[PDB]
Amino acid sequence: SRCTHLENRDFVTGTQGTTRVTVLELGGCVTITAEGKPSMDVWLDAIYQENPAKTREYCLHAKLSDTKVAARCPTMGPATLAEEHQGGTVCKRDQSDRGWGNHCGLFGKGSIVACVKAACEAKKKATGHVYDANKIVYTVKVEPGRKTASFTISSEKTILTMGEYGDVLCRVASGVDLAQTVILELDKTVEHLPTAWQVHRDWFNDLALPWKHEGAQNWNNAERLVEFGAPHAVKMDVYNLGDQTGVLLKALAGVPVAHIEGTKYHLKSGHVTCEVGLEYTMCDKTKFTWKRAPTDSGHDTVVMEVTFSGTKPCRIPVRAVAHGSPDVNVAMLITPNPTIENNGGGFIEMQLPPGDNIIYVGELSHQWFQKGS
């Protein structure tokens, strides 16, 4: 049973007349049983989209080149550069102090302009993705020989043949709310780093970086990584504000991550509401041995595994007695009707009273001391 591999588990049982059951959460496990039926474990395995939509690209490190400066004397008009009307450039117009000392006929303010071509460094890009509601995959799995059923809006019902156990509706509209989420993917390198983050839409749009849409050549607001120095006569420096990776990652401290499987972008949170259509004798006492000796489960119960070497299938004669009275079974069985099957069976979970008890499985025995509350 898959639900014996984790504590996150629910239990559903169908009575006489129940041929259907109704909210899976991503990463859980539901054990479903029913009158005259085999036991199945059901869970929401994955929520994802292959090749999701992109919003903005942001640049973390400006690639500045071809710095040019033009200047004029106080009454020689305005200074000008070709780059002021070109794309992919950042320019600043200012005024410097001109006079006889720096080759002007007059003393006063002189027009000056500095331009630089602003590109973006390789692998210094940050892409935000969003999900398309008609392309989100909800994959659910069932096991007794595991089978898989994936769901989408135009295909919400799948019938599975469970190997040899007979045959067994997930509403995609009853799943995850992805209205304000953007998946943040940086380029790759820096030794190692998360492949993606889950950030709020507002926060993403307010990112103070150069930005563009996929396929564009020129970066918008490229001046966000450019600092112009003070004007000095006929000069004015263009400075780079540096690599913003560290800045960003600090902003991402405390933020939830996501996952990229090649082309498939996975959520780390979610659920789906579904509807499922659902359509012995005693074990030889002398043939049990311990596979895993009775031990503390970690959640206030006792667990064990046994190996049985008699006729299969059969029902396990498990009981426990407290030191003091060997007539009365003190085992509160959590594993209902423990049974050895042809392919599986043998795991038992029980709860015992505080004190020195003896656990029995057929004639196989083991002492167990239960701690008080």
């Epitope: 030889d284 002398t286 043939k287 190996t307």
Partner: antibody, heavy 120, light 108 residues
Framework: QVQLQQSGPELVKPGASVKMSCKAS????????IGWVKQRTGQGLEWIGE????????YYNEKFKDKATLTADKSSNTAYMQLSSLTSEDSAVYFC?????????????WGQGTTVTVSS | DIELTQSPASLSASVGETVTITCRAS??????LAWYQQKQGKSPQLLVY???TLADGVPSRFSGSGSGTQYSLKINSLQPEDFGSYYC??????????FGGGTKLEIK
């Protein structure tokens, strides 16, 4: 009275296979385990394996897990042991024997034995 | 696995006397050990099961005994039909249901 009737002796060459039978007479076939035991000439007894004919459940000694295969036919009350790829090491008397399904604590009835001789 | 060591390996004794053979289990077999008698070229017969219970048809002079890991079989007033090979075996907890090597009992 309970009787386990085994098949006749086999003389086969190396690499050949034999299939021997055990027929149950005088008891409810499916309520008892059939166990197979090897005995080389003048040697001890060695447990091979066994089958619970009411459910088809089998157990095999690791030593013979690839040598022997056990089957059983409920309708004729007959169990079978088939021995594959024989060598001189398989020359021996093979016994079938009865055990109580549910309290399997002894082999209380034994067949007469099927002798297998592997030879040049 | 369980190993069953039989002791003595062999012994020679005469009619009317008493002999005792033993079977030592490498691990605890909770008294699920049976004894079988085998004559030359014949099929094994069940004598004792569950350490000390005689099988149907077996003479009172056969005493099954012991416990835990040390078992024994004692034969009072040996008769001619008692001579043969004696085997112990065990059906506890998990296979293989190993046998002992056997004790060989003969006349004088």
């Amino acid at each position: 009275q309970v009787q386990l009737q085994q098949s006749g002796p086999e003389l086969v060459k190396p690499g050949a296979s034999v299939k021997m039978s055990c027929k149950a007479s005088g008891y409810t076939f499916t309520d008892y385990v059939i166990g197979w035991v090897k005995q080389r000439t003048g040697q001890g007894l060695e447990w091979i394996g066994e089958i619970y004919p009411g459910s088809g459940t089998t157990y095999y000694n690791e030593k013979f897990k690839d040598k022997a295969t056990l089957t059983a036919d409920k309708s004729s009350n007959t169990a079978y042991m088939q021995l594959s790829s024989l060598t001189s090491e398989d020359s021996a008397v093979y016994f079938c024997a009865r055990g109580e399904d549910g309290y399997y604590i002894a082999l209380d009835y034994w067949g007469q034995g099927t002798t297998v001789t592997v030879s040049s | 696995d369980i190993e069953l060591t039989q002791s003595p390996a062999s012994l020679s004794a005469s009619v009317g006397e008493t002999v005792t053979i033993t079977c030592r289990a490498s691990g605890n077999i909770h008294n699920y050990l049976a004894w079988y008698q085998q004559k030359q070229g014949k099929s094994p017969q069940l004598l004792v099961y569950k350490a000390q219970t005689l099988a149907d048809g077996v003479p009172s002079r056969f005493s099954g005994s012991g416990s835990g890991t040390q078992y024994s079989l004692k034969i009072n007033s040996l008769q001619p039909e008692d001579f043969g090979s004696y085997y112990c075996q065990h059906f506890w907890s998990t296979p293989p249901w190993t046998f002992g090597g056997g004790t060989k009992l003969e006349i004088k």
